[PDB]
């Protein structure tokens, strides 16, 4: 489980915008 | 459970047809067999193409296609 703000943060860590934004780092 | 068939962009089919110009690589070994397998259905495809031929009053005609 995660909170909406945690989701917003994690979502903003994706390298690139949209469905193709990578999670690899 | 059922949902209608998804409409793909025409560039997807266009790219597949383009990338199968020269099937030199080993990766095409299965596609080559699919080509042979499609030959038995080619007369049907020809009929579908010809029956949908544009009439003299039509400059161009968009047709829905089903592609492997």
């Amino acid at each position: 489980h995660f909170t909406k703000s945690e989701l917003k943060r994690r979502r903003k860590t994706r390298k690139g915008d949209g469905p193709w934004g990578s999670w690899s780092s | 459970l059922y949902t209608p068939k998804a409409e793909m962009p025409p560039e997807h089919l266009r790219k597949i047809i383009n990338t199968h110009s020269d099937m030199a690589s080993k990766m095409y070994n299965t596609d080559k067999k699919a080509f042979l397998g499609a030959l038995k259905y080619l007369p049907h495809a020809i009929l579908k193409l010809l029956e949908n031929m544009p009439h003299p009053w039509e400059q161009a005609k968009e047709v829905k296609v089903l592609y492997h």
Binding site: - | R14, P56, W57, E58, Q59, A60, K61
Partner: protein, 48 residues
């Protein structure tokens, strides 16, 4: 020619503006009821 490979649609055909089709000139009054749609690909397909 037998030696000429089939043209690439997107490179040689898609960009050329199509020529006029065979459309007999309809009269504004004698063909009023048919003029706007007779030469459509599927005439009246959108008219419920």
């Amino acid at each position: 020619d037998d030696d000429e490979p089939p043209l690439s649609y997107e490179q040689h055909i898609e960009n050329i503006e199509p020529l006029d089709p065979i459309n007999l000139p309809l009269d504004s009054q004698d063909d009023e009821y048919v003029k706007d749609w007779l030469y459509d690909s599927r005439p009246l397909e959108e008219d419920s």
